[PDB]
């Protein structure tokens, strides 16, 4: 419900009530003007897609991607707002309301509405065995030349294969992950940020979509 | 079948209007129970609706009594109306009512509950003894089993919900 699309900037602590300290991730949630929505009448899933931070004008000589293009020009002219950089589905909520071309708000929530968080990982390059998966290393002394490699992979020749799904050294990777049931300690309106509880994925100046919980 | 040439009756002001393969006994105590019983031929002329098919099949000689006995289960209850009782035993029980939803207090942490159905007149006419009422004998034998399944009879003292008259066993203890 009301999937805002903020980005992080860091993490600090905020003293709650009587003595309680709770660590807080501060999520900068800039402008979010709703682009076209799609329903069951058109082709079959009721959803609201949302934009995020804008960029400059269109079609001069696009060296970068902070300039738009004739695809995203007419796709964003339809709602008569500036062209965008991050467009995300929300098939969670509310096919009825949310008129097209509406800024959403920042205060859809209250200080106590539980949320979820979807964001990409850090990604730590190509890393090996006992750092990626929870495997334990070998003995570092008494003569053993088996310090840190993964062990055996399969049996002898009554299974002449190695079974796929084997947890071998590959890339650590940034793939998506969703924590569940975080809460909001405080909402700001004027500086246009919110806060959450604990810590969410996705390193600084990243991207994170948040939405209501499913408890 | 030994209930083969043993047609039950058609004694009622009700009318067994056959159509397709079923009937609909539109009667005094209830309105038009209906079920397509089987694929067997029958007669319904004036006083005793009977049934017979081309005999000598041990899959159809047994299939007789599944058709005659159903047309005796239907017309008898819609004439009269019949269901059994449940006399709660021991102490602690106080089976009150909340309309069609009767609750029980058989010593648990919380009261049990139930949602009765149409054509089944739920009745509790005692301080702590209940008695169902309805039209369809198969349909009312369910709920009288479904309230036995709350606290079945504990075989030392005898506490627990029982039917009206039946020999529940008793084992002595210490």
């Amino acid at each position: 419900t009301k999937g805002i699309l903020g980005r992080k900037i860091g993490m600090t602590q905020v003293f709650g009530e009587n003595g309680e300290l709770i660590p807080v991730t501060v999520v900068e949630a800039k402008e979010n003007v709703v682009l076209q929505k799609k329903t069951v009448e058109v082709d079959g899933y009721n959803a609201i897609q949302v934009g995020f931070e804008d960029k400059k004008a269109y079609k001069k000589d696009a060296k970068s991607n902070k300039y738009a293009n004739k695809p995203a020009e007419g796709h964003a002219k339809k709602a008569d707002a500036a062209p965008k950089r991050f467009i995300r589905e929300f098939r969670n909520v509310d096919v009825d309301a949310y008129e097209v071309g509406q800024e959403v708000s920042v205060d859809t929530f209250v200080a106590g509405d539980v949320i979820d968080v979807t964001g990409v990982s850090k990604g730590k390059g190509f890393q090996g065995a006992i750092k990626r998966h929870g495997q334990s290393r070998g003995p570092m002394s008494h003569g053993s030349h088996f310090h840190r490699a993964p062990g055996s992979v399969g049996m002898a020749s009554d299974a002449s294969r190695v079974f796929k799904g084997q947890k071998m050294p590959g890339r650590m990777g940034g793939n998506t992950v969703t924590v569940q049931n975080l809460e909001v300690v405080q909402v700001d309106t004027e500086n246009k940020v919110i806060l959450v509880k604990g810590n969410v994925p996705g390193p600084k100046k990243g991207l994170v979509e948040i939405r209501t919980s499913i408890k | 079948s030994r209930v083969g040439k043993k047609i039950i009756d058609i004694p009622s002001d009700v009318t067994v209007t056959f159509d397709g393969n079923h009937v609909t006994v539109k009667g005094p105590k209830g309105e038009l129970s209906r079920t397509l019983n089987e694929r067997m031929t029958f007669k319904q002329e004036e006083n005793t609706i009977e049934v017979v098919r081309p005999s000598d099949s041990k899959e159809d000689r047994t299939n007789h009594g599944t058709t005659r006995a159903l047309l005796n289960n239907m017309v008898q209850g819609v004439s009269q109306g019949y269901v059994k009782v449940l006399e709660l035993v021991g102490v602690g029980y106080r089976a009150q009512m909340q309309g069609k939803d009767l609750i029980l207090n058989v010593g648990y942490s919380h009261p049990v509950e139930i949602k009765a159905e149409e054509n089944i007149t739920f009745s509790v006419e005692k301080n702590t003894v209940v008695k169902v009422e309805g039209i369809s004998k198969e349909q009312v034998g369910a709920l009288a089993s479904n309230i036995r399944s709350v606290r079945p009879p504990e075989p030392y003292k005898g506490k627990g919900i029982r039917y009206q008259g039946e020999y529940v066993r008793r084992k002595e203890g210490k």
């Binding site: 602590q13 003293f15 003595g19 309680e20 300290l21 | -």
Partner: protein
């Protein structure tokens, strides 16, 4: 933390002076400990006299481990000595005169005969 085979200058007036922990009893595969748990432990040193004697497996509560404890406001209590109190298996000590200032956290776990029998409690 205090784990499998630590050695603890016990604080009671009941004859033991140093004990060592066999197991940190709790859940299955329990490894670590901190203030308020209960460990089973066998004495090594023994004061002449006292109550208990050397080589007697006794159960004993943990008090004031070396690493801190995070109470829920943001504070920390770091002591400077691992210590212990031998319990009677009714959550009360053996002797009377336990030394060595005690953390407040062992109160929800109904150890309150130790706290009233103690010096300065934080």
């Amino acid at each position: 933390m205090i784990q499998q085979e630590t050695r603890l200058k016990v604080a009671d007036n009941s004859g033991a002076r140093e004990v060592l922990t066999i197991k940190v009893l709790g859940g299955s595969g329990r490894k670590t400990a901190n203030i308020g748990d209960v460990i089973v432990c066998t004495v090594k040193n023994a004061t002449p006299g006292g109550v208990v004697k050397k080589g007697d497996v006794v159960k004993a509560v943990i008090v004031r481990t070396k690493s801190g404890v995070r109470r829920n406001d943001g504070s920390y209590i770091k002591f400077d000595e691992n210590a212990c109190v031998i319990i009677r298996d009714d959550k009360g000590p053996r002797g009377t005169r336990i030394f060595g200032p005690v953390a407040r956290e062992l109160r929800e776990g109904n150890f309150m005969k130790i706290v009233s029998l103690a010096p300065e409690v934080l």
